[PDB]
Structures are given as structure tokens and as C-alpha cells.
């Protein structure tokens, strides 16, 4: 899920430094800037709030597969909170499979669960 995250984030930092020097931006640059901002918002974390890797992988997967492309940057923290709360009830078998086999579940189930959570998720 996250082999390329560090390189992509460094490239996004360089691109944000450079493209700050002009407003006439391309579609690809706009998409990369949006993705980088969302990733930076995702990586924030509070104090003394450990998170299991079986949930870290799920949230990073949801981020990197484009399911976060429409949430405003100010709502990502609450989105993650609600997602963990929803995973604590629905999709518990996903967590069991990840914890047991240390591998991603079937990608169809991931998409179904993420869409089901997004339908009940409401923008503030």
C-alpha cells in the first residue's frame, strides 16, 4: 500500500515549493497538490493515541486509492475518526483477515466497505 509514499511526499514538497511561484497551473499539478495536501492532513496524529497497523493500512489504502479525493482538507481528521468507529462495528472480518494473514483482503470488500462508510459520512 505505501511503498511509494515517502518518494511521492518528497516530490510533492518540491512541487509545492516550485509551483508556489505561479498561478497558471496544469491539471496534473493540481491533482498532485490536492493529493499531497490530503496525505499531509492524514499523517497528523495526536498524543498518546496508538493505532493498530491493521487500521493504519486501511486508512492509507483509502487515501492512496482515491477515495479521499473529494473530502475537503479540513474534514480528513474527522473522516478518519468516523472511519475507525465504523470499522469497529462493520468490516471486523477485514481486521481479522489482516491481523491473521498480514496481507490485504479482497479488494472488492475494501471498496464495498469504503463506499458504505462514505454514504453515511456527511461533510460538516
Amino acid at each position: 500500500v505505501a511503498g511509494t509514499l515517502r518518494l511521492d511526499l518528497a516530490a510533492y514538497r518540491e512541487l509545492e515549493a516550485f509551483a508556489q511561484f505561479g498561478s497558471d497551473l496544469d491539471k496534473a499539478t493540481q491533482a498532485k497538490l490536492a493529493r499531497g495536501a490530503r496525505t499531509v492532513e492524514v499523517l497528523k496524529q495526536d498524543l498518546h493515541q496508538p493505532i493498530p497497523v491493521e487500521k493504519q493500512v486501511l486508512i492509507i489504502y483509502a487515501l492512496t486509492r482515491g477515495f479521499l479525493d473529494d473530502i475537503p482538507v479540513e474534514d480528513v481528521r474527522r473522516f478518519e475518526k468516523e472511519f475507525y468507529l465504523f470499522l469497529d462495528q462493520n468490516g471486523q472480518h477485514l481486521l481479522e483477515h489482516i491481523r491473521t494473514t498480514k496481507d490485504l483482503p479482497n479488494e472488492d470488500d475494501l471498496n464495498k466497505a469504503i463506499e458504505a462508510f462514505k454514504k453515511t459520512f456527511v461533510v460538516s
Binding site: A11, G22, A28, K32
Partner: protein, 119 residues
């Protein structure tokens, strides 16, 4: 060993052109940061746009770096390198996205990555 009689006149010319384009790009990095990209001349915009492509294409995916990259890695001959760099200098690939030139290998991989990106 970088001499015309050792590597070839075309190899020497390609290397010198790449070096001078990158040197010219390095000088604009200071004025750009506080005068914006627009205030440059049309030709300097072109040299910046091509130098970005050169700089990003100079990277390569290593077999050893599989752990850090997730990609198998590639091996490319001198002839392919010089031909690809000559084409990039001549501007045959100015339309391709900037992000598509890094960690690729050959220009065939460059264009395939650009196509897979949707361009």
C-alpha cells in the same frame, strides 16, 4: 575519458548540450523564486521546461533499490541513453507530463508511463 576521440563526437555534443542546459537552468532558480515563472522570456521558459525533463530523466530504477522502490529495476545501454537524451533536448517529448520521466529507464518506458497516467 570524456573526449570526442574516445566516446564519439555525437556523444560529446549531447553531453555538452545537456550540461549547458542544466547550467542555464541553475542560474534562473534564484530569480524565479521571487519573480515568478511568467516574468521570464519565452525562450527561458522553454529551457526551464526542457531542463526539468532532463533532470527528472537522469534518474533510474535500480535492481538493488527494489526494497525502497517496489519496481524490478532496469538496465540501459549507452546508445539508448544518448538517443533518448538527444530526443529530449530536441523537444520530441515536450508534451509529456513532467512527473513521467523519473525512475523509468528508456524513453519507451517514459511514454508508456505517461500513457498509463492518462496522457
Amino acid at each position: 575519458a570524456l573526449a570526442p576521440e574516445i566516446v564519439g563526437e555525437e556523444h560529446y555534443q549531447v553531453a555538452r548540450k545537456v550540461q549547458q542546459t542544466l547550467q542555464r537552468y541553475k542560474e534562473l532558480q534564484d530569480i524565479i523564486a521571487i519573480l515568478g515563472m511568467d516574468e521570464l522570456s519565452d525562450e527561458d521558459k522553454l529551457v526551464v521546461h526542457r531542463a526539468r525533463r532532463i533532470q527528472f530523466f537522469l534518474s533510474q530504477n535500480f535492481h538493488v533499490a527494489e526494497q525502497f522502490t517496489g519496481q524490478p529495476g532496469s538496465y540501459v545501454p549507452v546508445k539508448e541513453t544518448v538517443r533518448g537524451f538527444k530526443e529530449i533536448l530536441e523537444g520530441k517529448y515536450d508534451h509529456l507530463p513532467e512527473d513521467a520521466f523519473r525512475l523509468v529507464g528508456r524513453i519507451e518506458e517514459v511514454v508508456e508511463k505517461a500513457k498509463a497516467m492518462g496522457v
